[PDB]
Design a binder for this molecule. Structure first.
Ligand SMILES: [Ca+2]
Length: 222
């Protein structure tokens, strides 16, 4: 997260760290057994760390659970990073408490102008911002025209832009797979962008509201 603020410890209870010897992506707990991330974060096996604030310090709030299965969207395509969503089945259910809570899947798509929160342990491009403690950022959803203008012809129906065309504030590498929460629901998944927090290069997110049929269909296929 570039230009954000350190989140109030555990204010983002659904936030998870994806770890394979080190933090490499984020994810969102959507229920006791499932995590939503980015298909570009795919690994056949990962350890999901819940209840985290400072990933480098044991706090007593964490839960480490290995995955029983990692399922990328059947239509994911890397050359254009389309359908950049993945489901992770936990090997054992998370324990919900003061530190671990799921985030609800969107009923409907949020329109342009909606103010949202993005969080993560990715690069902050700041000496002063410690990526080891969860960073938060409020970003507005951009219009389709501003989005397509920024990345001509590269925006599909499974993407939306959010952030600031002037730059300075954005998600960054390491934040990928993380949540974009708007009015208490998971609207996006940190996906891609050109650089981080650069003028004219807003962040691009996977558009969760068009994947609801696939998501629920899969969560019912345990
Ligand atoms: Ca910790």
């Amino acid at each position: 997260i570039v230009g954000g603020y350190e989140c109030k410890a555990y204010s983002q209870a659904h936030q998870v760290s994806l770890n394979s010897g080190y933090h490499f992506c984020g994810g969102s707990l959507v229920n006791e057994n499932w995590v939503v991330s980015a298909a570009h974060c795919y690994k056949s096996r990962v350890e999901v760390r819940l209840g985290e604030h400072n990933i480098k310090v044991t706090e007593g709030s964490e839960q480490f659970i290995s995955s029983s299965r990692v399922i990328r969207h059947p239509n994911y395509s890397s050359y254009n990073i389309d359908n950049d969503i993945m489901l992770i089945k936990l090997s054992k259910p998370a324990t919900l408490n003061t530190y671990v809570q799921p985030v609800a899947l969107p009923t409907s798509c949020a329109p342009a102008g909606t103010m949202c929160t993005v969080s993560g342990w990715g690069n902050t491009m700041s000496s002063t911002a410690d990526s080891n403690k969860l960073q938060c950022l409020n970003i507005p959803i951009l219009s389709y025209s501003d989005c397509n203008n920024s990345y001509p012809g590269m925006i599909t129906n499974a993407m939306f832009c959010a952030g600031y065309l002037e730059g300075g504030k954005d998600s960054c590498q390491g934040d990928s797979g993380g949540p974009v929460v708007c009015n208490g629901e998971l609207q996006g998944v940190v996906s891609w962008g050109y650089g981080c927090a650069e003028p004219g290069n807003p962040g691009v997110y996977a558009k969760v509201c068009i994947f609801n049929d696939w998501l629920t269909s899969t969560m019912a296929s345990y």
